[PDB]
């Protein structure tokens, strides 16, 4: 009974980082040595556990989180980072035990003209707690006046569209990310 990793990494559609997706992976024999030996992954960092020797461990629940962001931002997926992503979208805790996998996906999530389907939260009054998921779309009140659901001046929509274009630099290309949370 092998774990449904295929249903997460090889998924056809990934979610926007603001509404990141979580899959509960439990009751299955997982082989993590096939992942760390792929070369297709440009980012494979583990914290609290060693990359090698990952199979010699056992956990109560293993969560798989997925979303899309730019390359310039994959550095923010790690314990203790700051920036638009780790602040208002996806926050790892400081005592994080798991692995942060990510790979360039400019051939799937980019389109001629730009792919705006993917979104990220731009304004938020306070930072996220570790593993907080905020899908609220209320107008961000940046001024002294109420907004009452009307955009305008000092009344902005709190989500921004990424707009990945194939002709961009590598730092602003779409990247698919998977985060493994291990509960010992």
């Amino acid at each position: 009974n092998l774990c449904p990793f295929g249903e997460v990494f090889n998924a056809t559609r990934f979610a926007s980082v603001y509404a990141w997706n979580r899959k509960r992976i439990s009751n299955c024999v997982a082989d993590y040595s096939v992942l760390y030996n792929s070369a297709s992954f440009s980012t494979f960092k583990c914290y609290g556990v060693s990359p090698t020797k990952l199979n010699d461990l056992c956990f109560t629940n293993v969560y798989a989180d997925s979303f899309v962001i730019r390359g310039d931002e994959v550095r923010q997926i790690a314990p203790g980072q700051t920036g638009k992503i780790a602040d208002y979208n996806y926050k790892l805790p400081d005592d994080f035990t798991g692995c942060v996998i990510a790979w360039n996906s400019n051939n799937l999530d980019s389109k001629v003209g730009g792919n705006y389907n993917y979104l990220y939260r731009l304004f938020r009054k306070s930072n996220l707690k570790p593993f907080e998921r905020d899908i609220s779309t209320e107008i961000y009140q940046a001024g002294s006046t109420p907004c009452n659901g009307v955009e305008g001046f000092n009344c902005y929509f709190p989500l921004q569209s990424y707009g990945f274009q194939p002709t961009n630099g590598v730092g602003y290309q779409p990247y698919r990310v998977v985060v493994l949370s291990f509960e010992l």
Partner: antibody
Framework: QVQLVESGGGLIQPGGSLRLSCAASGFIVSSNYMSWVRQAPGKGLEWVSVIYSGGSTFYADSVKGRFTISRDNSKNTLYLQMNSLRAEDTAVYYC???????????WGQGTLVTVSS | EIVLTQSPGTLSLSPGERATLSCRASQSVSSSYLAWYQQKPGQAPRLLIYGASSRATGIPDRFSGSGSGTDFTLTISRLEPEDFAVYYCQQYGSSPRTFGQGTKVEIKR
């Protein structure tokens, strides 16, 4: 309605400290990104610091470890504590609200800071 | 580390002429993440264009920018006696954000 008024500028000895203020009207500094932008005499613009609405802060490399940007929610004022100033720090310091770490869409009036012995 | 080189350095033109300012970057500026600012003499910069095309609020229609990748351009269709200032382009497609050195729009005589 919406205004940005700087203060705290003046002549200061090299190596000394100075705190700039940015009284805001119509804005809520605790709800916007707030950046400091300095312009040396005759030269162009230069980004200094920024403080995200959530609290995170970032600094240019030429002022890293010497400047500290903060805010007082109670007085709706933006601060910029400068330490170990030097002559290359002399410039007009603007405080501006920027649209999310992107562009600065509303600027203040500017306050001159002169560092000279 | 993205460096913006505006050109020319000064631009001599008379009221009513078309003004075109260049802004070339060393590396690709992803997504057309480029702004344009105007600084009249003795005043705080003002925002003109955000996004290399999207016009700021209240800015007159004669301002209009274009460009993509490594070459941008702020154009002034019919210049006015109050558009003789320095214009800064600014990139935010990578950190840290950097400015240009400026283009001065003179008065041709």
């Amino acid at each position: 309605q919406v205004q940005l008024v700087e203060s705290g500028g003046g002549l200061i000895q090299p190596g000394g400290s100075l705190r700039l203020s940015c009284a805001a009207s119509g804005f809520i500094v605790s709800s916007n990104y707030m950046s400091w932008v300095r312009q040396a005499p005759g030269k162009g613009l230069e980004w200094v610091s920024v403080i995200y609405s959530g609290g995170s802060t970032f600094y240019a490399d030429s002022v890293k470890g010497r400047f500290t940007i903060s805010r007082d929610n109670s007085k709706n004022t933006l601060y910029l504590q400068m330490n170990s100033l030097r002559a290359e720090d002399t410039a007009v310091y603007y405080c501006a609200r920027d649209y999310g770490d992107y562009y600065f869409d509303y600027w203040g009036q500017g306050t001159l800071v002169t560092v000279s012995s | 580390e993205i460096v913006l080189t505006q050109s020319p350095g000064t631009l001599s033109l008379s009221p009513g002429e078309r003004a075109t300012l260049s802004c070339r970057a060393s590396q690709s500026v992803s997504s057309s993440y480029l702004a344009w600012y105007q600084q009249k003499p003795g005043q705080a910069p003002r925002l003109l264009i955000y996004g290399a095309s999207s016009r700021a609020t209240g800015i007159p229609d004669r301002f209009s920018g274009s460009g993509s990748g490594t070459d941008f351009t702020l154009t002034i269709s019919r210049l006015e006696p109050e558009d003789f200032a320095v214009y800064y382009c600014q990139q935010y497609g990578s950190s840290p954000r950097t400015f240009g050195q400026g283009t001065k729009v003179e008065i041709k005589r």
